[PDB]
Amino acid sequence: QSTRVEEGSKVAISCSLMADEGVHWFRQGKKPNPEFLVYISGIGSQNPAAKDKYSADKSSQKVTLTVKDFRKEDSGKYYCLMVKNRALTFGKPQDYYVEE
Amino acid sequence: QSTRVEEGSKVAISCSLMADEGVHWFRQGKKPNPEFLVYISGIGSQNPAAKDKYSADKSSQKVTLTVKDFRKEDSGKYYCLMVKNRALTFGKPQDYYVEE
Fold first, then answer.
1. In chain B, where are the structural domains located?
2. DSSP single-letter state for residue B1
3. Longest dimension (CA), chain A
4. If 0-12 CB within 10 Å is exposed, 13-18 middle and 19+ buried, where does residue B73 land?
5. What DSSP assignment string belongs to A1-39?
6. Which residues in chain A are closer than 8 Å to B86, comparing Cβ atoms?
C-alpha cells in the first residue's frame, strides 16, 4: 500500500484540495501519536517558517509539501486538511516509507 | 492493536486534550479517505446538530464522542484535534472495530 522512497531523497507530496484557504499538514507514523508538520496560509506563508525539512509551497491554489532528506522517522501517512465552516476537509492521504 | 467492539453497542471515545477551545473529530477507516464526523465548540455545541449517530459532549474541558449503534462501517482510528495558533494539536488516537 505505502510507497517505498529512497532514504535521503526529496519527496514532493501533493494535496488534492482546491486550496483556497489555509492548509494544515500532519502525518501518522508508526508511533502512536500523529505529528503536526506545517501550515501554509491562504496567501502562501508557512508556519513554522523553516523550510529545511518541511517546505510547503503554493501555486494556483495547489499546495505541495516537500519533505527533504526523507528518513525512516518520516515514514507514515501524510494528510492535508482545511478547516471551513466548523468542519474539516481532507485531501487524499499519501503514504511513504523508507525500508527498515 | 485496535479494540474489538460488540456490533450495535455504544462506544464513548475519550479525547485526551484539555479542550479549552473547539474540538474536531474525524476517523480513518479501511476506506482510503478519512471522514469528518463532528465538531464541538468551546461552549459545547456540536455541528452537525444531530446526535443520533455521533454525539459529542463536553464537561469541564473534556470532550467525549459517543458513537451510537457501532457497525462495521464505523471501524477505524478516531482522532480529536484543536486548531490553535496556525497549528494542530491532537489527542491520543483511539482504534475500534467490529469483527468482519
1. 1-100
2. -
3. 41
4. exposed
5. -PEE--TT--EEEE--S--SS-EEEEEE-SSSS-EEEEE
6. 22, 39, 41, 47
What cell was used for A48? 513554522
To what resolution in angstroms was this structure determined?
Answer: 1.4
A 36-65 residues with CB < 8 A to B: 36, 39, 41, 47
3-class secondary-structure state, position A72:
helix
Q: How far is CA A28 from the centre of its chain?
A: 11
Return the C-alpha cell found at B11: 462506544
Residue type, A20: D
Q: Which experiment gave this structure?
A: X-ray
Which 3 state secondary structure label does DSSP give A100?
Answer: coil
Q: Smallest CA–CA separation between B47 and chain A, in Å? A: 7
Single-letter amino acid, residue A87: A
